[PDB]
Design a protein around this ligand. Structure first.
Ligand code: CDL
Ligand code: 3PE
Ligand code: 3PE
Ligand code: 3PE
Ligand code: PLC
Ligand code: PLC
Ligand code: PLC
Ligand code: PLC
Ligand code: PLC
Ligand code: PLC
Lengths: 353, 161, 80, 78, 55, 95, 183, 105, 149
């Protein structure tokens, strides 16, 4: 062995890097479900899950394992194509969107000059996978929910796409990593505070989260498109929806809060000066530090997803259409003309460097 | 093994046996996906992403129209076909996949030689925009005109008022 | 197989299925434009490809509205 | 005539107020969008009072000296 | 014309979601208060001598 | 398309067969054949026949006509004048 | 730019499979009638670190080689072989002088570029030491043409954009010169 | 005169020069007929498809088969897998047959 | 009163990101540095005593075509796509180890196999009508006929 064992790890090293990447994202998604109930619980003056695992740390594990041990409801064993194709398209779409998220400089699985387009294009496929559940279905609540998913998609898709294009226009690049590194001297929350609200409002509508939870409105459509889903098809849709919440929270931190850039440059240098750069331990700490900055900013917006759910009532989707087309679109298309005019006036048209 | 050949073999099988309108809106998506992937891996990743960004929005609008027009007709109807005639048809079709008859153009491999003269190195989308907004700006402004006509056209067709 | 018009059996028996055939047929033209432009290293072909995609999406909307209003005409009593 | 609809060419100021009170989604989106070309019209002022435009980038290839080849250049020969 | 607030005053409360942000702040206050939950069966809710239970 | 293809001989022929499957006094049915006298149908038998003749021709007798019908020929007259093919989907006609 | 072409390595091996790409070698040397020349052996980071010193030393030969290309009128790679050999030798001369005169300062700068995505803005401190060492020993000054001497970006006192991560070796080597040279 | 055959970096591509010399020939006032510009047309079309050059390679491959020449003895060595562009194949002094890294540059 | 129990899931979510970043930043950087040490396994893994400290190369991002030519050029000198060398002169094997990719130029499979997308007036002409290929074969034949002159 020895030599063969050692260079076999080199042959498998990048697969473990991906497995660690997949594991890291699933841990956040699993414990976001726990964190939402804890956050809502204390805002509602209850506790939230604290009896499943020590202080409630196994609540996510129990929910998945219990649902994975449940019978799948379908007319026939060969009818898996009906209620499984939809959940898989939704899950594959959001998971592929994580390929362009950089945890540090150059630490993204996919890096390209069109990472922004890939991000928007990949998430649009997830919208398609949701409507497939109401595939000439005899469940009227699934059918009623499919109509509302299309209505919400029309609402947010134009606004969310145009907002990201304004951010890409300010840096003159469609690479996500370049957009993060362009925020060294200024975080785009300050120049584009209106766009951060609009991006978050669009994210709530995209993820079908309250106050835009018109798709899975329990008081209206029992469970929406999920009313007929049980066991594994229900987990996959539930897993993908909370994956999208983490993705859009991380994108809010990337487009407006500098991504992985440190909160304090002075403190960032102080912490990293303790470790020799000629040792591998420096790069572990730096990887923890940079992702920690991204984690802190994304945790706040994952908190904000839960926060808005516990404070605001639901808005009807026909009002959401008027809100997105009569209010958000005119404002965003004004800024898409405003921003290039300001930059040209001061001879500051952006270039890639 | 070029697995895209198998994907198109399955798609051609399902296009012959498709019965209702939902299956047709799935043949469309089952067609764009092989196009997007093959463009991504061979010729243009830019246009692989442009296809996804634009066609998906068209697909969902197409799907929502199926809901408003589905009319019970083809769920209970019968088709005959025959498994043997389907597979024989697909076999004869698969025999001839040479869209071009220039054997040398299809068999002899070529290369290009790189040069270092292009020191200002930017993406294809920046050059496309550079030409589209400067030299072919008329083409862009006519396209803007056609998009405006569609907005007026859709209203004068659909709106009862 | 093409000369006996095998494509006429692959098109579904609804008006919307004719719309999908038209989109697929036009998409074949754009894929051919992208393929030639990339081999030649020519951005004029890619500008043409982008124009085809935008224009093909315009007629998809115009045709859909005609089919939408056609269905409304049948459901015209609307006593409710 | 407490709350009539103003006529734009007779009462331009009151006509602006009506839309700013009743249709804020229209009045202020336009107001933001107007700031684009207005700043582009203020560009000549900047070129005279703050700072001039930068020198263009050398994005046209290698800068070839506008002269004939030096026929007396030697060195690093075979 | 018979309103008490200017057009910009009403549009700033409108575009910047004044009352929505206030509702969030009120909710965030509860996050720092003591919850009401008791840990049954280790703790029991109050009972009175008039309570009706098992015969 | 949306027009009748009915002849007086076919409607009479289909009416006779549908009336032959009942328990009638005589199998010799023509236009002048009455329901009460020739075939011998009471109140309930007659309305069973009318609904049976409705299903065969996909027509619905109005209440005024049904209560006042006497002869087989009256039914044939009604079917010829009132029959319409059912509307088809937007795809059956144009495709 | 990550566009797939037929002139270099593409993004992944799925691109090679679709194109049936063959990576072809040629075992033949250049013909013996053409004089031989030793190629430049430096990689990306050393070459970028030495880019402005090769420019300040081989400017006459670089321009003469490029002017030969314009006058070749399509017959470029054949008619400028002799001019190209001068360019290669002059560039190797600069790299040779760097490794004998400014070896530690030079290796410091391109080890920072490797550490910092090969962005010049991330390695100003090591560049300043290398510029000072080269100027004293080779009399080469880095100049960015087309702009005033006092608006050159590499001499900016308070740049807007600065590296997030600090190269520890560059920080140490910058402090040592501060306390010993600029007393 | 609109631009044609623009490379992916905005400048002329490989075949622009052939096209430019065709336009100059066809539009020159010294030419009585378009016969002088016929060779320039073939050169431009050869720049894009290389059809005659591919045809020449077809003849050389076929002519080598009929004389029994080995394809692997008269051709050029090649590697099909990018991971195996190893230092031994590249000819380095301390070369090895271990795979090269292509996962992340 | 800060509820620490509610903040526990956020701590695990925070550690979820740090797990991904800590592994990716160190594992990738180490591998790039390891493969930049030399052209064989005995130099990449073993550390010489006379060698100095290890200088690490961080992952690259925001590249263009020049970086692709640089990566191949580095491979021909060091056996790595991010090799390190500042020698003024290359090895002899660098003069004859150029890599030239040769690829087919065929249309996409979806273009020539999709049941519907492959049918058009010009595609049928290209596939079933010999009028075009008869003319272009004349051009190729002239090349060999004209050799003698
Ligand atoms: C740090 C700042 C807090 C501090 O100094 O110590 C208090 C804090 C403990 O809170 P505490 O001792 O109950 O507060 C004293 C009285 O009990 C508190 O008694 P009280 O409830 O009567 O006092 C009320 C006080 C609330 O108590 C506070 O002052 C908290 C401050 C909240 C704002 C900053 C957060 O005032 C408020 O209600 C303000 C709430 C409204 C602010 C809304 C947010 C606006 C933005 O000590 C710590 O900071 C460490 C504990 C935090 C958890 C650490 C481990 C987390 C677990 C992660 C997994 C591992
Ligand atoms: C698994 C299916 C993989 C399908 C496939 O063909 O992948 C090709 C893969 C290429 O080799 P690869 O390990 O990816 O390269 C590493 C170089 N440092 O070669 C392989 O198939 C290796 C796949 C084995 C690793 C599977 C996942 C390991 C982690 C499990 C925990
Ligand atoms: C994440 C994977 C998602 C897909 C997994 C399910 C695999 C099923 C086939 C997927 C697409 C393959 C090509 C099918 C094109 C559409 C034709 C069709 O009608 O769907 C096939 C499906 C099977 O129904 P079946 O009973 O076999 O036939 C009818 C019998 N009277 O009849 C149905 O109506 C069921 C369709 C369910 C909804 C599928 C929506 C399309 C999704 C396509 C995404 C992938 C793109 C295609 C990739 C493969 C290309 C061949
Ligand atoms: C991300 C980028 C950032 C995007 C956000 C940019 C932030 C800036 C926001 C742009 C809007 C700034 C303009 C605000 C001033 C215009 C509003 C106004 O003056 O009021 C409307 C005015 C009518 O007057 P009124 O307000 O009704 O006063 C009586 C109240 N009873 O009607 C008028 O007559 C005023 C006409 C305009 C004159 C001033 C110019
Ligand atoms: C995540 C890591 C923390 C584990 C929590 C824990 O060990 O949890 C304690 C467990 C679960 O029992 P419970 O009733 O849910 O505990 C909750 C206590 N309450 C009710 C007060 C809140 O008890 C055990 O030891 C029994 C199982 C044997 C150990 C295997 C645990 C599962 C391993 C899978 C994850 C590593
Ligand atoms: C709105 C509140 C957030 C905010 O104001 O965030 C922006 C500000 C100021 O950072 P900045 O000027 O955008 O540049 C970012 C400079 N760093 C890299 C030192 C953070 O961040 C903080 O003070 C935190
Ligand atoms: C130029 C600077 C741009 C500013 C950028 C922000 C733009 C926001 C526009 C809001 C307009 C609005 O709330 O619109 C209200 C519309 C329709 O309301 P209506 O029927 O017209 O009644 C109101 C008209 N009144 C009062 C004049 C009569 O629907 C809504 O209730 C939308 C509620 C959105 C709440 C989403 C929660 C987000 C939480 C974010 C936490 C981080
Ligand atoms: C200077 C800045 C302020 C200028 C405000 C002028 C308002 C004019 C107006 O509103 O014009 C008035 C008319 C007609 O009014 P009405 O509502 O149809 O009926 C009138 C009222 N009644 C019922 C009492 C009779 O409206 C329009 O044509 C609206 C066109 C606005 C389109 C804006 C789209 C968003 C673009 C934003 C940038 C990307
Ligand atoms: C800094 C970045 C985060 C916050 C950004 C947006 C904040 C709201 C801006 C619009 C305010 C406005 O329009 O102000 C209008 C109103 C008050 O005005 P009035 O009704 O005339 O007051 C009546 C007369 N007084 C002036 C004497 C009182 O103010 C507010 O309700 C302020 C509410 C803020 C409290 C909650 C703060 C934390 C929110 C959650 C942050 C995550
Ligand atoms: C911040 C901080 O010091 O981060 C320490 C971390 C996480 O702290 P947290 O409160 O869970 O971060 C959650 C971020 N929120 C509170 C904004 C949602 O804890 C350790 O792993 C140690």
């Amino acid at each position: 062995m020895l030599n063969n064992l050692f260079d076999f790890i080199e042959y498998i090293e990048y697969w473990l890097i991906i497995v660690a990447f997949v594991a890291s994202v699933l841990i956040v998604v699993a414990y976001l479900t726990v964190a939402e109930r804890k956050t809502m619980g204390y805002m509602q003056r209850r506790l939230g899950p604290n009896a499943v695992g020590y202080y409630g740390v196994l609540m996510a594990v129990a929910d998945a394992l219990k649902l994975l041990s449940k019978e799948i409801v379908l007319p026939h064993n060969g009818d898996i194509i009906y209620v499984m194709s939809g959940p898989l398209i939704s899950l594959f779409s959001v998971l592929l969107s994580w390929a362009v998220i950089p945890f540090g400089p150059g630490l993204s699985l996919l890096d390209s000059e069109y990472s922004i387009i890939y991000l928007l294009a990949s998430g649009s496929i997830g919208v398609f996978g949701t409507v497939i559940v109401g595939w000439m279905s005899n469940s009227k609540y699934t059918v009623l929910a499919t109509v509302r998913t299309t209505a919400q998609l029309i609402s947010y898709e134009l606004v969310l796409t145009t907002v990201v294009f304004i951010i890409a226009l300010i840096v003159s690049s469609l690479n996500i990593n370049v957009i993060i590194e362009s925020q060294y001297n200024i975080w785009y929350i300050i120049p584009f505070f209106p766009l951060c609200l609009i991006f978050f409002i669009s994210a709530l509508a995209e993820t079908a989260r309250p106050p835009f939870d018109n798709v899975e409105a329990e008081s209206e459509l029992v469970s929406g498109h999920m009313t007929e889903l049980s066991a594994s098809p229900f987990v996959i849709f539930f897993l993908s929806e909370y994956c999208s919440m983490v993705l859009m929270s991380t994108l809010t931190a990337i487009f407006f809060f500098g991504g992985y850039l440190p909160f304090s440059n002075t403190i960032h240098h102080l912490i990293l000066n303790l470790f020799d750069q000629h040792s591998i331990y420096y790069f572990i700490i730096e990887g923890i530090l940079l992702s920690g900055y991204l984690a802190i900013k994304a945790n706040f917006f994952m908190f904000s997803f839960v926060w808005i759910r516990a404070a605001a009532p639901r808005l009807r989707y026909d009002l959401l259409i008027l809100f997105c087309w009569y209010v958000l679109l005119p404002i965003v298309f004004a800024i898409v003309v405003f921003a290039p005019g300001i930059l040209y006036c001061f001879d500051a048209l952006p270039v890639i460097i | 093994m070029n697995l895209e050949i198998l994907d198109l073999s399955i798609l051609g099988f399902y296009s012959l046996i498709s019965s209702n309108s939902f299956e047709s809106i799935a043949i469309l998506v089952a067609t764009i996906m092989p196009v997007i992937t093959e463009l991504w891996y061979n010729y243009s990743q830019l246009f692989a992403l442009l296809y996804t960004l634009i066609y998906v929005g068209a697909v969902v609008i197409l799907f929502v129209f199926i809901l408003s027009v589905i009319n019970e007709k083809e769920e209970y109807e019968y088709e005959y076909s025959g498994l043997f005639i389907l597979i024989l048809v697909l076999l004869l079709d698969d025999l001839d996949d040479n869209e071009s008859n220039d054997n040398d153009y299809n068999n002899v491999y070529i290369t290009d030689y790189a040069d270092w003269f292009n020191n200002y190195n930017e993406s294809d989308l920046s050059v496309i925009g550079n030409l589209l907004f400067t030299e072919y700006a008329l083409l862009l402004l006519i396209i803007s005109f056609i998009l405006l006509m569609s907005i007026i056209g859709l209203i004068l067709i659909v709106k009862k008022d | 197989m093409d000369l006996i018009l095998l494509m006429l059996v692959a098109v579904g028996l609804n008006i919307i299925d004719i719309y999908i055939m038209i989109e697929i047929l036009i998409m074949g033209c754009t894929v051919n434009t992208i393929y030639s432009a990339s081999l030649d290293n020519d951005m004029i072909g890619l500008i043409y490809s982008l124009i085809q995609i935008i224009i093909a999406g315009v007629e998809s909307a115009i045709g859909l509205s005609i089919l939408v209003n056609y269905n409304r005409i049948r459901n015209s009593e609307e006593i409710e | 005539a407490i709350g009539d609809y103003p006529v734009y060419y007779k009462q331009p100021i009151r006509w602006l107020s009506y839309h700013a009170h009743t249709r804020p989604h229209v009045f202020y989106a336009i107001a933001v969008a107007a700031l684009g070309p207005v700043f582009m019209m203020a560009t000549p002022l900047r070129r005279k009072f703050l700072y001039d435009d930068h020198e263009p980038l050398p994005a046209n290839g290698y800068p070839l000296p506008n002269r004939s080849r030096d026929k007396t250049l030697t060195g690093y020969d075979d | 014309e018979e309103s008490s607030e200017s057009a910009l005053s009403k549009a700033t409360k409108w575009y910047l979601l004044s009352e929505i942000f206030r509702g969030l702040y009120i909710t965030l206050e509860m996050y720092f208060r003591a919850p009401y939950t008791i840990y049954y069966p280790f703790e029991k809710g109050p009972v009175s001598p008039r309570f009706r239970g098992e015969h | 398309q949306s027009a009748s293809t009915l002849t007086k001989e076919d409607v009479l022929t289909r009416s006779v067969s549908v009336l032959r499957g009942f328990e009638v006094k005589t199998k010799d049915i023509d236009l002048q054949t009455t329901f009460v006298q020739d075939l011998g149908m009471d109140s309930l038998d007659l309305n069973d026949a009318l609904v049976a003749l409705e299903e065969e021709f996909d027509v619905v007798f109005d209440d005024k006509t049904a209560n006042e019908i006497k002869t087989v020929g009256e039914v044939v007259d009604f079917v010829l004048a009132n029959y319409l093919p059912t509307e088809q989907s937007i795809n059956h006609t144009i495709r | 730019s990550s566009t797939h072409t037929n002139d270099s390595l593409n993004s992944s091996n799925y691109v090679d499979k679709l194109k049936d790409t063959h990576f072809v070698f040629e075992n033949d040397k250049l013909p013996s009638e053409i004089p031989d020349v030793e190629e430049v052996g430096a990689t990306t980071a050393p070459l970028l670190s030495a880019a402005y010193f090769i420019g300040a030393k081989c400017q006459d030969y670089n321009d003469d080689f490029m002017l030969c290309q314009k006058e070749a009128k399509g017959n470029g790679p054949i008619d400028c072989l002799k001019e190209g050999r001068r360019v290669t030798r002059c560039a190797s001369g600069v790299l040779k002088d760097l490794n004998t005169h400014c070896s530690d300062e030079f290796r410091l700068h391109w080890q920072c570029l490797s550490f910092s995505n090969l962005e010049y803005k991330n390695c100003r401190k090591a560049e300043s030491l290398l510029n000072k060492c080269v100027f004293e020993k080779m009399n080469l000054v880095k100049k960015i043409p087309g702009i005033p001497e006092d608006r050159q970006i590499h001499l900016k006192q308070n740049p807007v954009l600065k590296p997030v991560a600090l190269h520890q070796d560059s920080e140490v080597a910058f402090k040592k010169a501060q306390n010993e040279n600029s007393i | 005169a609109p631009l044609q055959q623009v490379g992916r970096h905005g400048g002329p591509n490989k075949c622009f020069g052939e096209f430019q010399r065709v336009v100059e020939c066809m539009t020159n006032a010294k030419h009585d007929s378009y016969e002088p510009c016929n060779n320039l047309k073939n050169d431009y079309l050869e720049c894009r498809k290389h059809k005659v050059e591919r045809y020449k390679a077809f003849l050389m491959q076929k002519h080598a088969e009929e004389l029994g020449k080995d394809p692997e003895e008269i051709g050029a060595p090649f590697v099909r897998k990018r991971r195996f562009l190893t230092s031994k194949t590249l000819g380095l002094v301390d070369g090895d047959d271990y795979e090269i890294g292509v996962e992340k540059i | 009163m800060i509820p620490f129990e509610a903040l526990i899931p956020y701590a695990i979510m925070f550690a979820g990101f740090c797990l991904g970043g800590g592994v990716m930043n160190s594992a990738i950087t180490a591998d790039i540095t390891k493969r930049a040490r030399g052209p064989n396994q005995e130099i990449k893994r073993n550390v010489g005593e006379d060698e100095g400290p290890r200088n690490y190369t961080k992952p690259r991002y925001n590249t263009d075509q020049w970086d692709k030519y640089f990566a191949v050029r580095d491979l021909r000198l060091t056996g790595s796509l991010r090799g390190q060398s500042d020698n003024a002169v290359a090895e002899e094997s660098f003069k004859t180890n150029s890599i030239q990719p040769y690829s087919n130029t065929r249309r996409p499979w979806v273009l020539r196999r999709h049941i519907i997308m492959k049918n058009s007036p010009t595609k049928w002409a290209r596939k079933y009508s010999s009028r075009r290929d008869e003319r272009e074969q004349e051009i190729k034949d002239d090349y060999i006929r004209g050799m003698g002159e």
